[PDB]
């Protein structure tokens with residue numbers, strides 16, 4: 001994962017559970033206590049999993065809920081970096097463009113494997129969206145949907161339809177229902 005993102009996640013872990021919890025977990029993975037996470041460096045996905053695991057211990061909270069909260073909080077940070085993706089958009093159109101955005105933002109990186117996030121309308125007030133990735137970050141994905149609903153102030157309900165791994169690709173399909181209709185007739 002790009003260090004940009006991992007560093008963002010660490011700050012949220014710090015902001016949520018405290019410098020003590022985080023600093024102890026960054027040492028159990030061998031990180032120097034003075035490490036500066038540059039943008040372009042790529043941090044190993046399993047090192048991040050270890051970090052999140054230690055924080056789950058040192059807090060008693062389930063690591064899925066930690067990932068969910070990190071997801072909810074990350075949307076705000078993305079609006080700081082990419083305000084054009086948020087400007088003038090409604091929630092449903094933001095969600096439907098995420099698949100394309102993740103392609104556009106990784107296509108200059110050799111060997112990038114961005115998650116697929118295809119969304120399609122299934123009713124006047126609902127869409128389906130399917131996460132597809134080697135990385136199996138189900139709760140991060142769910143948390144980002146929830147954070148998007150809070151950012152845009154459009155309430156939704158999320159129904160999980162299917163989850164599972166095929167080969168190495170994890171897949172999670174959800175049905176997102178908007179409390180008000182989002183389509184026109």
Ligand code: HEM
Nearest residue numbers: 002078082085098105113114115133135137140141144145
């Ligand atoms: C403007 C908002 C957003 C931006 C700019 C953005 C961008 C990115 C980028 C560049 C990555 C790294 C991909 C890679 O390294 O392969 C990523 C990771 C990820 N993105 Fe987003 N994202 C946004 C919102 C969302 C939303 C709304 C969702 C879900 C609906 C989502 C789902 C994910 C997941 C689950 C990952 C982790 C990688 C994985 O599971 O394979 N993102 N995001």
